[PDB]
Amino acid sequence: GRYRIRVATGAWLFSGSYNRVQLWLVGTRGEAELELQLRPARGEEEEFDHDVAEDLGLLQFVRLRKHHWLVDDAWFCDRITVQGPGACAEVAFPCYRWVQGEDILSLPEGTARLPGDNALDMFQKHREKELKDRQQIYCWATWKEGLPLTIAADKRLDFEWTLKAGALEMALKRVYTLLSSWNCLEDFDQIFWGQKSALAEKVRQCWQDDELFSYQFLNGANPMLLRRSTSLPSRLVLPSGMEELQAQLEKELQNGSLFEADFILLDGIPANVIRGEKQYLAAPLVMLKMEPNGKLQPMVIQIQPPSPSSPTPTLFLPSDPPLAWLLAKSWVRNSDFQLHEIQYHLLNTHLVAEVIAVATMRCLPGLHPIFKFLIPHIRYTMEINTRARTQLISDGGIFDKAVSTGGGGHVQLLRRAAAQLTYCSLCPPDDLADRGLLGLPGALYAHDALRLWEIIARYVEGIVHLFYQRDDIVKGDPELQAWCREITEVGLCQAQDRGFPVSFQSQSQLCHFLTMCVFTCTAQHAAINQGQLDWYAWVPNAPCTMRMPPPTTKEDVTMATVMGSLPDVRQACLQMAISWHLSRRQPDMVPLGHHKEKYFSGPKPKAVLNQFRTDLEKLEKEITARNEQLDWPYEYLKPSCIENSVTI
Amino acid sequence: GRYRIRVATGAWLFSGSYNRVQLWLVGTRGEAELELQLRPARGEEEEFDHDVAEDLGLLQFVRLRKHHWLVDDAWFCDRITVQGPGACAEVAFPCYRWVQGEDILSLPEGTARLPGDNALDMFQKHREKELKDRQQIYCWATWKEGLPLTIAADRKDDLPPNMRFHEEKRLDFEWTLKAGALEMALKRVYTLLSSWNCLEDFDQIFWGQKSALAEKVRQCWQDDELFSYQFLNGANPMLLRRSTSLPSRLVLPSGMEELQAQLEKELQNGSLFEADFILLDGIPANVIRGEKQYLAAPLVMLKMEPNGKLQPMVIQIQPPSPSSPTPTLFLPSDPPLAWLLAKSWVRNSDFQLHEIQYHLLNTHLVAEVIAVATMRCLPGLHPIFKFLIPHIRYTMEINTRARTQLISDGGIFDKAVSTGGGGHVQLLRRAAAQLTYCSLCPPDDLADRGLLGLPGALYAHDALRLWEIIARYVEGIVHLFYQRDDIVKGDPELQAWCREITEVGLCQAQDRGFPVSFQSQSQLCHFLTMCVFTCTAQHAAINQGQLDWYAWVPNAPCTMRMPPPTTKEDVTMATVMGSLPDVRQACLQMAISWHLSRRQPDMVPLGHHKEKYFSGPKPKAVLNQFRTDLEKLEKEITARNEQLDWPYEYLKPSCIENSVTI
Ligand SMILES: [Fe+2]
Ligand SMILES: [Fe+2]
């Protein structure tokens, strides 16, 4: 028989000209040792023809052993397609990994399989051995107690914070030295350098108007906090002489047009000590009304919650001294930065995707269809999360030197956010319905996220119904239930009380969970991550820290109070530096659904992926056609802008 | 005997509101003592009337003293115009100078006068004592040995006060320094955490230009057509010459006979062009922050296509050596990164020979020599001084600022550029050896380089048009004040000025074609056309292209941090990025390019100096003609540039600075 082996190689660090790899073509009945002289080249899927004597039959495995290689040499094998005798289709053998060590690497058949009761099966023994190895090379590690577990620590964020921190402090000190005329609001202009978008310049022009401030809770960088008020909040205590606000609040409550954004998760979080001076934090509540034209308007801001020391806090109105109102809006924006960069971007998207990634690597073998479905969406997640825990959110890290929740309070905020990290909150048809953002016309994030949920759910159902045709197939899959408990009981630290499933009992439960996983890894991260390029490039639109306590009297708020509460040159330039470094477009960006890795080998999972791409193209056309009529477009959930995994 | 005195004031810093000037209306038959009270206004000139009793006759001088002024009060008098009692015209007395001290300042009548043999003439005695004072105020200095001499000023405050910046220029310079410093500090902060591993990382510091052509350079810098277009119409169009023969350093190894055939075919066609950077051979490279920079002396061969565009043929980054007899010849059909690195090395060397030879030496140092020699040997009455004083303004201060900040020891050039740290001085000495009078005259230089008649050579076309317009201007003024050639020979101040430029200022440049004397009207006309073109048009051509072509750092790097490549297959992106400057050197190159090439808000266009040194109707009609011809050339260049994808805008006469000011 004539076997045609096409080797697709991702990357290679071959020191020599040619390297020899032994390639056993393991089939049902017999195997065939072949020697391959690897001469890779970019975009060259090296073909090798071989004439065998024995009949291997249907191929099942491909075994690779790097015969007498160099120590430094490395080879990332993408896939091995073997065309057997006759016109038989090119059987694919997904590798997509660094072939490392002198041990024999076994690549099974690319058709995805579920485990069975036959322990003497070749794919069953292979997936058991692969799971035993991948539970050894992927280990859970607790970073902080009460937080979800991480991967064990044993180019877009690749630096050293200890080496760069002193030079960054000297650079910020020289900016402080050559620029010390800071008294007015426009003085953030001379540090406003970079690739500012049209939306970023529109934020610069129009951040002070109340409708942009209200627009940020719906379609800003953090659209995850605004909920429709079913009742007035218990922390909203109105003092005497403010019965007109009470009448307006009850009128907007009865009309269903009352909305709230409560930052109560930040109450009691100890603030950072940045360069000696103690920063300050608050837990505001902004009450907003939905005007009949479709635009939110702010009703009231309560910067601090009630306390035993202050039973009724100051309620700042949009019809107050304009600088007190500006400072109240800035405090809300600072707290939106705090709850955005910790709860909704770091916890709800990064740490959840890292838990999904580690559990997918640990409990789903390479043959499993859910692994092949999820491995494009978990790429570089543990790497970026480890770099974040090493540099961004470490002790004395980036957050300890830039952000007011840093220095220890961000860990407490992560604990409090993981306390309320619910499975309802990670699903937009559940989160937006719980928050009452369904049917809202101006809620462009909610509309795009619901449309993405429909498309991603179509993708998930299309993949799942090929391999799980009945509910008892979902129940009887032990690797799937192990992956489910590894997410819920182990990775998310017993999150079954937070709505996460302990086991899968139906097709639809698994479909909802996998839709949540793909939405968290791709769409929710895009919606929570693309906002810092334009909304957070202007430091007064979202301060990273506040250097003064929140105001208690409106008439004492001057420009000196606003400018003293707003960050100085070092904190603001550091915040813009981080926001510019994190939200820049990397050249290796893979859009959603457009991964070039062919893990599945059947034509029907590929057809499901093509329908996913077609629906995403239709959604991108719809969002683009919607956005021309809007002066404030929502481009954060365009599928071309949605990255295929949490990589930043 | 009613005399009308209009005192036009250029500038003033008055601590009080009571400043008095004693004035003397010195005529042929006597003088009149008058007292004026200066109340200057912006955009207006002061009006006075005085009745005299003695018939002063024809007015010749106006003498000024500041009667009991404060120490900090300063007055910059523009001119004083006196109208007599009869129906005679107004008589101009140009000052355009800071009136300082308790001494009497004498301003002669504005008609330009040649020196004469009458030693008892009042104007002759005045110009003699004026030259004696100016030769003590304007002194030569040897900044470095082997270079053209500079004004004697260790710092900018040691300069003569008339050569200082005015308030708008100085304030703009300080604002430019702080704006560049803030932009560099912001770039340092914002790209300190960023990675530096690909050419798109140079995008991270390129935002904020607002220069359209620089964005086009960003789009098309890897194009070989743009790389070859820069030799004709880029920031440095002064090096490319047509090859009359193959260069001797162009050593082709075995097996490369096709390139030999192409070079010989383009040589026999006459379309072979060369840009040789051999003046940089052996120049010691900088060591910036302990990191060794690297230099090279490339040679790039070019061919004119029949469409009119240059295309590159071969780059030899290093010249042949006893250790390396045949260096690597880089071709457009090479591993792309090796050819990109070779083009980057050529553009580094173009930056080196542009910012040192053709900008610092050929324009700034030559205009400084012209300025210092004009202020040493030409008095205020001399027509050539009145001709040349608008074209030498702010040159001494910008050169002193360069010698204290930019090209000083440990200066900005020693912190950004590969020739810094001492090698730029050796490069300057070598370039001053090649600083010929032919190279400063665009008819002679563009005939010598063989760039005449090229339709795509827009610098050459605009430079010849500007040369003939400026030469018409020079011819009008000179033929007004020199009817015959013996009058040119018989002018001792003119010959002294010629010797001060050639023998003294340019350090005995008679061997480089510079005249030691003027023997004809047309020799003086050619020399003055060279002086005006060097001060105004050549500096605009060599200077205004720094932000359009130098803002994108890979288009023209200031330095190289890796040795030039010897093998083409080993050139990776890591080699290109490690060779190209890091973010601090690149940001400093961007800052200096924007600082030097931006349009000054106080820019005087060429020919549009408002100072009225000449009093006669005829020199002013000549200046009018000059401005009319310049606006005709402006219309021609604009109509040409409207049909060009890559327009040449540096020689528009509205954009040409009237002197070397930046
Ligand atoms: Fe992220
Ligand atoms: Fe210049």
SS (H, E, C) B138-205: CCEECCCCCCCCEECCCCHHHCCHHHCCCHHHHHHHHHHHHHHHHHHHHHHHHCCCCCCCCHHHHHHH
Contact B186 A195 (CB under 8 A): no
- The verdict on A539 touching B (C-beta cutoff 8 Å) is no
Residue of A157, A162, A175 for testing the chain B interface, max B β-carbons within 10 Å: A175
Dihedral angle at the C-alpha atoms of A100, A101, A104, A109, nearest 10 degrees?
Answer: -10
Nearest to A288 by CA among A394, A135, A442, A398: A442
- The verdict on A195 touching B (C-beta cutoff 8 Å) is yes
Cα A321–A324–A327 angle (5° rounding)?
A: 150
Q: Give the list of residues 6+ apart from residue B334 with CB closer than 8 angstroms, or none.
A: B342, B568
Nearest to B661 by CA among B397, B405, B407: B397
Instruction: Return the residue of A nearest to B185 by Cα.
Output: A175
Ligand 2 centroid from CA B402, angstroms: 10
Calpha distance B336→B343 (Å, rounded) = 10
Chain breaks in chain B (C to N over 2.5 A) after: none
Query: What amino acid is encoded at B313 in this protein?
Result: M
The three-class DSSP label of residue B571 is: coil
Query: How far apart are the CA of B197 and the nearest CA of chain A, in angstroms?
Result: 9
Give me the residues paired with residue A94 across strands.
Answer: A79
Calpha distance B383→B586 (Å, rounded) = 46
Helix crossing, A444-467 with A603-627: angle to 10°?
170
Helix crossing, A161-178 with A569-582: angle to 10°?
130
Please give the distance of CA A524 from its chain centroid, rounded to a whole number. Answer: 6
Question: Could you give the strand order of the β-sheet that contains B74-83, starting from the edge strand earlier in sequence?
Answer: B46-51, B2-13, B74-83, B91-99
Nearest to A449 by CA among A375, A528, A510, A512: A528
Buried residues in A9-35 as b, exposed as e (16+ CB within 10 A): bbebebeeeebebebbbbbeeebbebe
Contact A577 B183 (CB under 8 A): no
Query: What are φ and ψ of residue B639, in 5° steps?
Result: -70, -30
Picking from A156, A175, A190, the nearest residue to B189 by CB comes out as A175
Give me the residues paired with residue B314 across strands.
Answer: B301
Helix crossing, B336-353 with B423-433: angle to 10°?
70
CA A564 to each of CA A175, A560, A561: distance values in angstroms, whole numbers, following the listed order: 18, 6, 5
Residue labelled with tokens 């050039």: B413
* Residue B272 structure tokens: 């072979």
3-state helix, strand, coil in chain B (%, to 5): 45, 15, 40
Query: How far apart are the CA of B285 and the nearest CA of chain A, in angstroms?
Result: 27
Ligand 2 centroid from CA B542, angstroms: 8
Cα B324–B328–B334 angle (5° rounding)?
A: 165
Calpha distance A66→A101 (Å, rounded) = 8
Partners of A156 on chain B (C-beta within 8 Å) are 195
Contact A171 B181 (CB under 8 A): no
**Number of residues that make up chain B:** 662
Sign of CA dihedral B585, B588, B590, B593: negative
* Residue A439 structure tokens: 């049917």
Sign of CA dihedral B154, B160, B162, B163: negative
Residue A226's CB is within 10 A of a number of other CB atoms, namely 27
User: Where is A612: in which H helix or E strand?
Assistant: helix A603-627
Query: What amino acid is encoded at B616 in this protein?
Result: G
CA A622 to each of CA A448, B409, B615: distance values in angstroms, whole numbers, following the listed order: 10, 62, 74
The three-class DSSP label of residue A47 is: strand
Nearest to A290 by CA among A326, A253, A235: A253
CA A40 to each of CA A19, A78, B569, B570: distance values in angstroms, whole numbers, following the listed order: 10, 12, 16, 17
* Residue A214 structure tokens: 């209200």
Strand A227-228 versus strand A258-262 pairing type: antiparallel
Q: Give the list of residues 6+ apart from residue B494 with CB closer than 8 angstroms, or none.
A: B378, B382, B384, B488, B518, B524
For chain B, the C-alpha Rg in angstroms (whole number) is: 27
Name the experiment that determined this structure: cryo-EM
Picking from B182, B189, B207, the nearest residue to A577 by CB comes out as B189
Calpha distance B82→A496 (Å, rounded) = 101
Query: What are φ and ψ of residue B343, in 5° steps?
Result: -65, -35
Residue labelled with tokens 């580094």: B348
Where residue B363 falls (left for φ over 0; alpha for ψ -120 to 50; beta otherwise) is: alpha
Do residues A304 and A452 lie in contact, with contact meaning Cβ atoms separated by under 8 Å? no
Contact A174 B185 (CB under 8 A): yes
Do residues B623 and B473 lie in contact, with contact meaning Cβ atoms separated by under 8 Å? yes
Calpha distance A338→B317 (Å, rounded) = 54
Calpha distance B376→B75 (Å, rounded) = 23
* Residue A541 structure tokens: 């639109």
Residues contributing to the annotated binding site of B:
359, 364, 539, 543, 662
Query: How far apart are the CA of B559 and the nearest CA of chain A, in angstroms?
Result: 23
Partners of B183 on chain A (C-beta within 8 Å) are 193
Do residues A523 and A592 lie in contact, with contact meaning Cβ atoms separated by under 8 Å? yes
Calpha distance A502→A485 (Å, rounded) = 5
Q: How many helical (H) and strand (E) elements, i.e. helices and strands, does chain B have?
A: 21, 17
Do residues A587 and A648 lie in contact, with contact meaning Cβ atoms separated by under 8 Å? no
Buried residues in B79-98 as b, exposed as e (16+ CB within 10 A): bbbbbbeeeeeebbbbbbbb
Calpha distance A194→A291 (Å, rounded) = 35
Cα B490–B496–B499 angle (5° rounding)?
A: 120
- The verdict on B289 touching A (C-beta cutoff 8 Å) is no
Burial of B307 (0-12, 13-18, 19+ CB in 10 A): exposed
Calpha distance B202→B558 (Å, rounded) = 14
Instruction: List the end-to-end C-alpha distance of chain A, in Å, as a whole number.
Output: 48
Helix crossing, B167-190 with A161-178: angle to 10°?
160
DSSP string, B45-71: -EEEEEE-SS---SEEEEEEEEET--S
Calpha distance A27→A409 (Å, rounded) = 57
Q: How many CA atoms lie within 13 A of A446 on its CB side?
A: 25
Query: How far apart are the CA of B164 and the nearest CA of chain A, in angstroms?
Result: 26
Give me the residues paired with residue A227 across strands.
Answer: A260
| Resolution of the coordinates, Å | 2.3
Instruction: List the end-to-end C-alpha distance of chain B, in Å, as a whole number.
Output: 48
Do residues A126 and A367 lie in contact, with contact meaning Cβ atoms separated by under 8 Å? yes
Calpha distance A419→A270 (Å, rounded) = 18
CA B137 to each of CA A422, B131, B142, B156: distance values in angstroms, whole numbers, following the listed order: 83, 10, 16, 14
Query: What amino acid is encoded at A406 in this protein?
Result: G
Burial of B341 (0-12, 13-18, 19+ CB in 10 A): buried
* Residue A521 structure tokens: 């890894």
Do residues A315 and A611 lie in contact, with contact meaning Cβ atoms separated by under 8 Å? no
Residue labelled with tokens 């890795």: A597
* DSSP assigned state of B509: G
Calpha distance A191→A539 (Å, rounded) = 10
* DSSP assigned state of A240: T
- The verdict on A158 touching B (C-beta cutoff 8 Å) is yes
Q: Give the list of residues 6+ apart from residue B642 with CB closer than 8 angstroms, or none.
A: none
User: Where is A62: in which H helix or E strand?
Assistant: strand A59-67
Calpha distance B555→A629 (Å, rounded) = 40
Query: What amino acid is encoded at B162 in this protein?
Result: N
Residue labelled with tokens 């002070």: A208
Residue A482's CB is within 10 A of a number of other CB atoms, namely 18
* Residue B642 structure tokens: 């409207």
* Residue B608 structure tokens: 């549009």
Calpha distance A519→B437 (Å, rounded) = 73
Where residue A279 falls (left for φ over 0; alpha for ψ -120 to 50; beta otherwise) is: beta
DSSP string, B329-393: EE-SSS-HHHHHHHHHHHHHHHHHHIIIIIIIIIIIIHHHHHHHHHHHH--TT-HHHHHHGGGGT
Q: How many helical (H) and strand (E) elements, i.e. helices and strands, does chain A have?
A: 20, 17
Q: Give the list of residues 6+ apart from residue B271 with CB closer than 8 angstroms, or none.
A: B303, B304, B305
DSSP E strand boundaries for B260-343: 272-276, 287-288, 291-292, 299-304, 310-316, 329-330
The three-class DSSP label of residue A69 is: coil
- The verdict on A306 touching B (C-beta cutoff 8 Å) is no
* Residue B309 structure tokens: 């565009």
Calpha distance A580→A193 (Å, rounded) = 10
Nearest to B378 by CA among B131, B608, B556, B575: B131
Chain breaks in chain A (C to N over 2.5 A) after: 154
Burial of B423 (0-12, 13-18, 19+ CB in 10 A): buried
Contact B190 A577 (CB under 8 A): yes
Contact B190 A164 (CB under 8 A): no
Residue B331's CB is within 10 A of a number of other CB atoms, namely 17
DSSP E strand boundaries for B588-659: none
How many inter-chain contacts (A to B, CB under 8 Å) are there? 58
Calpha distance B393→B396 (Å, rounded) = 8
Calpha distance A522→A374 (Å, rounded) = 11
Dihedral angle at the C-alpha atoms of B92, B96, B97, B99, nearest 10 degrees?
Answer: 50
DSSP string, B214-243: HHHHHHHTT-HHHHHHHHHHSS--SS-EE-
- The verdict on B574 touching A (C-beta cutoff 8 Å) is no
Calpha distance A348→A525 (Å, rounded) = 8
Calpha distance A264→A338 (Å, rounded) = 12
Residue labelled with tokens 């050596």: B321
Residue of A581, A588, A648 for testing the chain B interface, max B β-carbons within 10 Å: A581
The three-class DSSP label of residue A2 is: strand
Give me the residues paired with residue A23 across strands.
Answer: A34, A64
The three-class DSSP label of residue A79 is: strand
Nearest to B599 by CA among B210, B167, B187, B183: B210
Ligand 1 centroid from CA B165, angstroms: 53
Q: Give the list of residues 6+ apart from residue B86 with CB closer than 8 angstroms, or none.
A: none
Nearest to A633 by CA among A444, A451, A449: A444
* DSSP assigned state of A564: H
3-state helix, strand, coil in chain A (%, to 5): 45, 15, 40
Q: How would you write A178-197 as a 3-class SS string? A: HCCCCCCHHHHHHHCCCCCC
* Residue A245 structure tokens: 């606000």
Nearest to A324 by CA among A561, A539, A549: A561
Picking from A164, A174, A178, the nearest residue to B193 by CB comes out as A164
Calpha distance B495→B374 (Å, rounded) = 11
Do residues B93 and B380 lie in contact, with contact meaning Cβ atoms separated by under 8 Å? no
Helix crossing, A507-518 with A444-467: angle to 10°?
130
